[PDB]
Ligand binder design. Structure first.
Ligand SMILES: [Zn+2]
Length: 74
DNA sequence: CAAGTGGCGCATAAGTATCAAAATAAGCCACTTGTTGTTGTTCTCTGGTTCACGC
């Protein structure tokens, strides 16, 4: 569905990345986001800078993202 | 001025849940070498050297 489609698009370089999310927590220290082709941030998705995995982002809660393996010992 | 509060959400998070696809041990049986156990047999040891002793 959308997950594999956006993974392919970001792998091919259609969308750029913005490694800065302007956040207080350490979750965004090693996490990035996806920008649309018109320099607009996408909704509900996050990108990682070490293992390069796209995950669903929820505005209501971010506890699940803390369980990501790349953030094990950070 | 400055020590005291709400507020605007607010970006965070220690909690909870259920939906999958895997990582494991349990009870049994195969079966082949090597390996341990009673329960028999078979050959010596002690029968004994001279003194009390009366017959
Ligand atoms: Zn990661």
């Amino acid at each position: 569905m959308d997950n594999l489609e956006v993974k392919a698009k970001i792998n091919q370089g259609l969308y750029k990345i913005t490694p800065r999310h302007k956040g207080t927590s350490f979750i965004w220290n090693v996490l990035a986001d996806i920008q649309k082709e018109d320099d607009t941030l996408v909704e509900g998705w996050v990108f990682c800078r070490k293992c390069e995995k796209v995950l669903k982002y929820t505005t209501r809660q971010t506890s699940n993202l803390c369980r990501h393996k790349c953030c094990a010992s950070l």
